[PDB]
Design a protein around this nucleic acid. Sequence first.
DNA 1: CTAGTTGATCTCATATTTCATTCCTACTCAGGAGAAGGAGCAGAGCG
RNA 2: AUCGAGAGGA
DNA 3: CGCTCTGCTCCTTCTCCCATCCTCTCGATGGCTATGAGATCAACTAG
Lengths: 503, 49, 98
Amino acid sequence: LRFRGQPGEAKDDGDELYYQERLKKWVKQRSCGSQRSSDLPEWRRPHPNIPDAKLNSQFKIPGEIYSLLFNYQKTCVQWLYELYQQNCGGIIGDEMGLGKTIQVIAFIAALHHSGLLTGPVLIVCPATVMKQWCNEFQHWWPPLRTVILHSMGSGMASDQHILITTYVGLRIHSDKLLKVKWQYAVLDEGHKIRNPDSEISLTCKKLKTHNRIILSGTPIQNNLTELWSLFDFIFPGKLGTLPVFQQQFVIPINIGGYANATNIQVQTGYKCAVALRDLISPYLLRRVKADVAKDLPQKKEMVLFCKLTKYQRSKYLEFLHSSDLNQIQNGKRNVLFGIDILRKICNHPDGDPKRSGKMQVVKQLLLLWHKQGYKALLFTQSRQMLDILEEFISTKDPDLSHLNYLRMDGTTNIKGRQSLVDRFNNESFDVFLLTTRVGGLGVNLTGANRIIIFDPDWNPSTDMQARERAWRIGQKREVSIYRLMVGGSIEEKIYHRQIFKQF
Amino acid sequence: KGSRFISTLQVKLYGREGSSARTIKATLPYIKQDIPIVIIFRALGIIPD
Amino acid sequence: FNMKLAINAKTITSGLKYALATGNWGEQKKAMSSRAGVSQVLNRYTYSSTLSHLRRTNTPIGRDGKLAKPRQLHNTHWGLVCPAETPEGQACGLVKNL
DNA sequence: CTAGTTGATCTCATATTTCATTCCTACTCAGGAGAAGGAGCAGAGCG
RNA sequence: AUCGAGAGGA
DNA sequence: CGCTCTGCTCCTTCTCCCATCCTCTCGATGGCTATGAGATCAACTAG
């Protein structure tokens, strides 16, 4: 169905058939010259990469990549090498920013030469992340035939060694490409899947092969709540799967683990979690910054205690008194909106900042730092709020946007996004409003000196991710985190709820 | 007594003495069958005719 | 203790209110023992228009398509209700007046 | 003619769990009339 | 608005 | 004359339907999730 009708669809049929067969647009843009089997005769002359692992006695990983690996990565890759030789999975729990992609590649270098793994290898990560990785696979080890599985018709058409693709691509066509002669498979950050009830989790399970490995920036200390679903892939024949765990460990964990108000203790639930957790010793790999983070400041944090005004206090209570949410019934639109509304009494209200204690706290802190000359981040998880905060600092109090304010929208591509990061870190800009998700992207704003959280996420360990970007190694000034919490409001209820996750 | 019930017992006189009126049966609380009064008398602790 | 009592207070106050307001004395969920024949509002056009409400009595119904035996004047009605004061039509004997 | 860039629209992951249960009729008159369906019975031919 | 409920008129 | 079979009579249960037209008043109640972010596709535009 297209406005142009069948005449337009005939054109679509042209390209459609071409995607399945050979599309000249695709041939010119992402095939001819891109390390294809007909190109590799030219590319492998620069990179014949003779595997030291097979060539030289007593070697496990080839020097071409091994010498690019850091001493700790060298160690971890050798550990992974052995996991493959043991026919088992594992968790590459190396801390964020240390690098794991090259470790996978170093491992692969050895696989198809010392391991004789001449067949297909599956690697999955985000599309822009793959733009980078595609070049890395191509320039690091082309002896393994490069196949990039981007799209359905054309991607699937390349049914041949190393397979490069994405999570979007998995939803585009992984139901067709199942068990495609995979000799080794690895997924990037395991928490790109994380959700136990997702279709991604089901997809991850579907991706079955000889040896299944997942990379991650997290540990197994107490993240089992979601690791149970990652175990489906990583340890299908070592620990079991999520639905097993749902009855095996989850039942006693849920019964006692939340400080049960009757007769069951947390320790019992914990002990069950321990029984599973501590099985993953020889399969857990972890590089730590204890021997890397040699030049950075103290990771400081605190919580602000903002009180409600007569106006605010009266209105969030009035909503609760007049809306009668429990007769509407619970989980309904206005009931659930109430959860956000009771927070919006200070985030909005619709409404000069004189009616909001939070807007007044932010005002005072930024004007202090205005004279201090400190760079600062604002932290907010909402576009409606991103613009409301901008209206606060531009239509209600212009001088706060006049402190060299900067912000990413997301519609801007990576070229512009990178310049936004650079703009804040360099003297050009002093204030930037940041969201956890762009913290995930790579917005490493270490130039910041002070950070105000206007409206955080509902999980301290995700707030952490944004903070880690702000605290990247190489930073030369101390940065304190200021959580703007409003006393008596639902923000404290939210505060304690997200603590319960961290707890 | 906070109930009232306004319930009822039925006494059935079965037509005519030529056949069916031979007996009288009563509809009793939660009972599936109508029961002859002589059975009821036994239940009442009453034996002698 | 003092929380469940608040629930009850609302429930009683508004529940009793509501039931009479709708004129149904059951669960209010569907055909729950309607008492629409009982609940109504004061007819205010004159003095006797209110006296009408005093004397009018809501009799039980014989559904539609039924009148005489009941409705038909019985001589035990003598002296208790006024046989002249009966509304005509569907209400013919439905409403009695003392 | 075509490559670049940027707006539009559709579809998606990662935190609250939250919380119990809802409850019985008390039962009142409620009908008319005629079809449809089963159940038992009685007698006729058969063994 | 959409039902429901109740009264009056022919 | 019993066996059997069948047709005959009775009983029991089920199912659907309440004139036409008009006028006013009351009223209750509805009316219940997300969330922007990301990515890819189309459209315009300039070299």
